[PDB]
Amino acid sequence: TSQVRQNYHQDSEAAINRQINLELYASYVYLSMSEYFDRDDVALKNFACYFHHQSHEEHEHAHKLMKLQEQRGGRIFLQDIQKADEDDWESGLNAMEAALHLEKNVNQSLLELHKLATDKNDPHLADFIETHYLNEQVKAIKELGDHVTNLRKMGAPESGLAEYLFDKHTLG
Amino acid sequence: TSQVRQNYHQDSEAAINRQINLELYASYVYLSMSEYFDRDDVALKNFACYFHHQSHEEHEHAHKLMKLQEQRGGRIFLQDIQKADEDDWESGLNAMEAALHLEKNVNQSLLELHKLATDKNDPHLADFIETHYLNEQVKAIKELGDHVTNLRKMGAPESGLAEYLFDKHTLG
Amino acid sequence: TSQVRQNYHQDSEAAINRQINLELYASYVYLSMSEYFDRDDVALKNFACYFHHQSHEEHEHAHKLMKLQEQRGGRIFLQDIQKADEDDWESGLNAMEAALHLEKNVNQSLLELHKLATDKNDPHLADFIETHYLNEQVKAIKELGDHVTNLRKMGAPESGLAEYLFDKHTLG
Amino acid sequence: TSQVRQNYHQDSEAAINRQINLELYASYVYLSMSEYFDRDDVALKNFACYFHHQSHEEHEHAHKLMKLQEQRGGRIFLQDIQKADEDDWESGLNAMEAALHLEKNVNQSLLELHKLATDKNDPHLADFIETHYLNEQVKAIKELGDHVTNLRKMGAPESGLAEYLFDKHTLG
Amino acid sequence: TSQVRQNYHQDSEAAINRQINLELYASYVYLSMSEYFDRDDVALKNFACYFHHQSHEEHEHAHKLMKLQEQRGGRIFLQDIQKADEDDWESGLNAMEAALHLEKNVNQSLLELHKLATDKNDPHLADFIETHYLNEQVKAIKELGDHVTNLRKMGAPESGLAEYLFDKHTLG
Amino acid sequence: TSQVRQNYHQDSEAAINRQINLELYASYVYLSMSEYFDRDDVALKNFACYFHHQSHEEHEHAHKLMKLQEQRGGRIFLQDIQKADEDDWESGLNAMEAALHLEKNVNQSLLELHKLATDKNDPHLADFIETHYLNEQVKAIKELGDHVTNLRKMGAPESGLAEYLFDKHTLG
Ligand SMILES: CC(=O)NCCNc1cccc2c(S(=O)(=O)O)cccc12
Ligand SMILES: CC(=O)NCCNc1cccc2c(S(=O)(=O)O)cccc12
Ligand SMILES: CC(=O)NCCNc1cccc2c(S(=O)(=O)O)cccc12
Ligand SMILES: CC(=O)NCCNc1cccc2c(S(=O)(=O)O)cccc12
Ligand SMILES: CC(=O)NCCNc1cccc2c(S(=O)(=O)O)cccc12
Ligand SMILES: CC(=O)NCCNc1cccc2c(S(=O)(=O)O)cccc12
Ligand SMILES: [Ca+2]
Ligand SMILES: [Ca+2]
Ligand SMILES: [Ca+2]
Ligand SMILES: [Ca+2]
Ligand SMILES: [Ca+2]
Numbered sequence A, B, C, D, E, F: 001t002s003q004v005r006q007n008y009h010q011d012s013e014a015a016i017n018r019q020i021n022l023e024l025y026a027s028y029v030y031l032s033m034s035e036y037f038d039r040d041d042v043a044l045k046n047f048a049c050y051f052h053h054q055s056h057e058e059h060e061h062a063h064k065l066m067k068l069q070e071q072r073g074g075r076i077f078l079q080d081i082q083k084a085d086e087d088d089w090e091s092g093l094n095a096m097e098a099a100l101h102l103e104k105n106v107n108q109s110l111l112e113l114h115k116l117a118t119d120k121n122d123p124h125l126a127d128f129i130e131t132h133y134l135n136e137q138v139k140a141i142k143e144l145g146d147h148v149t150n151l152r153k154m155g156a157p158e159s160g161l162a163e164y165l166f167d168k169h170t171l172g
């Protein structure tokens, strides 16, 4: 038991590990989306850059959690980063829709992590989730929501012109 | 026989000459495309600038080969630069499609030039092709591929609005 | 079959995918090492920074390969990033030794990738491996070799003073 | 018949096309001369640079004409760029003499183009020839004349020292 | 057997050593030429500077090879640097001719080194030779070729004025 | 007999040649030491840089002597640069000890060169040795002495920590 450990329940420790893996999974899904839009038969460069940026963001979210684990005296146990559910993301709108869905899932897990921290009277971990994750999630979900709305109204996916112009004007 | 000649087979020499002529031909095809888009009944200024730039690029590719020929002690024998297969390129998408096709043909010739250099154990010429041509070809083909994809999805050629906006947003 | 595909054998395509996964695995192993040295009962900050840097380097190596796959007209198929063989890296010297070992394994795979490219007469892929990977591997292996040597001579791992000073003077 | 066409006789249009091809031919001859002086058994670097510059100048002369054709509503029809009369230019003086001769021929064609424009009462085309070509030709011919004179007086071609020093002092 | 050694055949190792010695020999020959032109009865200062520069260039070529040897896990075994075939280089043209000859010999050895690397499936060593040596050799040989040509045409060696002016205008 | 020769005895001339060869030998020994410390099983980077610097210093010492030879009207006759007595320098301390020993030997030769110049009443050569060599030798010997002392007191060679820290703090 670590010299620095204080008020850090083994349930929280294990949940942080589960959360670390999910951020890496989120990161990985976005990496897959990113390369998809670089395919010569898709070729939406800004969609690619956007999702490549999201990928590195999710990585930072993982780093912060790993840091937290060692700051608290817990032990990091890493698990396989699972490949995404699809290799082919079909369209710009569909990728946004899958992204929105993924972010809500990460958010649900984070909310249960906060519940766990409240239940265990770990107020340092509660504030840590609120400060670095909860509003970041709310912002991400809303932005993805905004994108899905604009793509739908522009006539995507039955309009290839729509995805082209959105790539230029919103993501460019 | 040149004072500088070393390990330079007469088959390679002649193939370099054939390759020089092809770069000039590629350059010439692009020059034709370039002026086409400046026609008052076509008037796509950025398509014109793009193909005018491609023309001068193919010229540099020719210069590098001519330089190589004299560096190795071979003799340059120049042949007529043949006019392109068409005077009228029909549309933006069609020009891109013809360009992609042309670049693949130049690439095939370059790959056979590399085979010839491997077969003749000319490793200076092999590296010369790899370094200055092979990846340049791969990049060009992919970019042209990307363009053809975006034009097709935007509704070209049955959409004049599509070619207009692509000229503005991708080539502008 | 892609509009851009030329001279790109399905065996090479699949091998690039296998190589992509290995770079990500290498990246992941280094991430694990990085966080290990941030543990309060290890606390070697520069060892941590060094391995964190190696992690992002292996990521770039993966990006370049993914780019190559789509440049050539192949399709990226991503696989799970497997967790490392150990959660606890024991010591500075041991991590270096595991790193050297890992890099030699990545190098062996890259050499077989080059053999495959030679065998398939894909000279663009051969040069791609030589240019961006082979010397990077040779440099990495030698640097890791240098580190293992200095740590061993300093009296590691039976000297905690040795690992402390190496962290300060070589990695600082 | 073009929306922009006005006072532009089909004889002028065809003559512009013939002139375009000649500028490209002139450009091509100069390119041949340029590489000749880079041969290891010739090795006059400044003669090479001078003729390489002349080559690109003749290209601009072609561009201006192509521009003119489309400005006037004519249609560009490109023809093969014929290879030069010689692959081996023998000496510095001989290349200058061939260049002077070529320029006078281009000038004669331009003068007949002006006659055609006068005869057809196309004063825009007449001024276009006067403004951008006639004095450029007069300057070129005189400069080439000056060079041939100096080379002859210096003792070329029976003096290799003469061609060396002229390369250094006039073209350097 | 080194901790870093991988795919590095003992034949390649020994050939690198033989090549190291030759670069040093080349360096030494050039040093001899350099001082020769500083003799009061020769006194061609720029010929001296040119060959002094060549000497240090060949030294760098040796350094790069020594670096390569230790990067690969081979052991450097150094041999005597043999003195040149002549103490008296006779003339500027003769030194250039001896230099051209020497460089072709170094090039032949490098080409056999590449063959050895191909035969041993050492693609890191093959690329190393291509990248850092083969084109450097091609450039050197051609430059020396150019110099010998100009000196011969200027009337060297029966013209002391020729060697004087070449020293001033080409090497100055 | 040279136009510039004055008061320059053939014994001095020959001794300068013998001294030139020794500086080159010293240079060569240091080059060998330099690469030794870059071996992956030695890996003392600053020891390597120090000895690499010593190597180029001994080269300058050779240049100055060659210059002197031609300034005085003597003729340079170069001899083989002999390889060092050892390929493997064993340790940092041992290399310093071998270096100190070598420098004393060069110094002894220089002192006999001065004696020769005094005996031959060549006061230009005497001052040349005093000015450019004798104090440089005294400084070098003392510095090497200082290094050997510090290494011995630090516990080298039975302390690998000692050689590591000396590499960092004195040579870094
Ligand atoms: C096509 C493309 O990739 N465009 C750039 C998109 N933006 C980005 C991508 C990756 C990382 C980024 C980072 S960082 O996480 O590395 O700090 C910071 C800021 C922007 C980033
Ligand atoms: C309408 C139009 O022509 N726009 C400019 C397009 N870009 C270019 C065209 C021609 C040559 C270029 C060159 S260079 O080959 O001359 O160096 C370098 C960079 C850009 C170039
Ligand atoms: C303790 C710690 O992390 N220190 C910084 C170590 N260096 C680095 C770490 C991660 C990424 C780096 C990157 S980049 O891949 O992001 O471009 C570029 C340069 C250095 C990098
Ligand atoms: C050895 C050599 O080539 N030297 C340079 C000679 N000058 C030139 C050559 C080619 C094009 C030039 C151009 S432009 O047409 O590209 O604008 C403008 C100005 C000078 C130019
Ligand atoms: C008369 C005379 O010696 N003139 C200077 C000639 N050029 C040179 C000589 C030696 C070394 C040089 C180096 S370097 O190898 O030291 O980096 C770099 C650049 C030029 C160099
Ligand atoms: C690892 C390594 O090599 N580090 C640099 C060590 N210092 C030096 C090495 C070689 C030549 C030097 C020279 S000069 O002789 O080229 O002028 C001047 C100053 C320093 C020099
Ligand atoms: Ca996000
Ligand atoms: Ca799985
Ligand atoms: Ca191109
Ligand atoms: Ca024809
Ligand atoms: Ca690495």
Ligand SMILES: [Ca+2]
Pocket (backbone or CB within 6 Å): A080, C082, C083
């Ligand atoms: Ca697993």
Ligand SMILES: [Ca+2]
Pocket (backbone or CB within 6 Å): B127, B130, C127, C130, E127, E130
């Ligand atoms: Ca290569």
Ligand SMILES: [Ca+2]
Pocket (backbone or CB within 6 Å): D054, D057, D058, D140
């Ligand atoms: Ca002209």
Ligand SMILES: [Ca+2]
Pocket (backbone or CB within 6 Å): B080, D082, D083
């Ligand atoms: Ca013909």
Ligand SMILES: [Ca+2]
Pocket (backbone or CB within 6 Å): E054, E057, E058, E140
């Ligand atoms: Ca050289």
Ligand SMILES: [Ca+2]
Pocket (backbone or CB within 6 Å): E082, E083, F080
């Ligand atoms: Ca001998």
Ligand SMILES: [Ca+2]
Pocket (backbone or CB within 6 Å): F054, F057, F058, F140
């Ligand atoms: Ca010294």
Ligand SMILES: [Ca+2]
Pocket (backbone or CB within 6 Å): E080, F082, F083
């Ligand atoms: Ca010997």
Ligand SMILES: [Ca+2]
Pocket (backbone or CB within 6 Å): F127, F130
């Ligand atoms: Ca004195």
Ligand SMILES: [Cu+2]
Pocket (backbone or CB within 6 Å): A052, A055, A056, C059, C063
């Ligand atoms: Cu990335």
Ligand SMILES: [Cu+2]
Pocket (backbone or CB within 6 Å): A023, A026, A057, A058, A061, A062, A106
């Ligand atoms: Cu996240």
Ligand SMILES: [Cu+2]
Pocket (backbone or CB within 6 Å): none
């Ligand atoms: Cu717009």
Ligand SMILES: [Cu+2]
Pocket (backbone or CB within 6 Å): B052, B055, B056, D059, D063
């Ligand atoms: Cu142009």
Ligand SMILES: [Cu+2]
Pocket (backbone or CB within 6 Å): B023, B026, B057, B058, B061, B062, B106
């Ligand atoms: Cu090309």
Ligand SMILES: [Cu+2]
Pocket (backbone or CB within 6 Å): A059, A063, C052, C055, C056
């Ligand atoms: Cu990171």
Ligand SMILES: [Cu+2]
Pocket (backbone or CB within 6 Å): C023, C026, C057, C058, C061, C062, C106
């Ligand atoms: Cu890697």
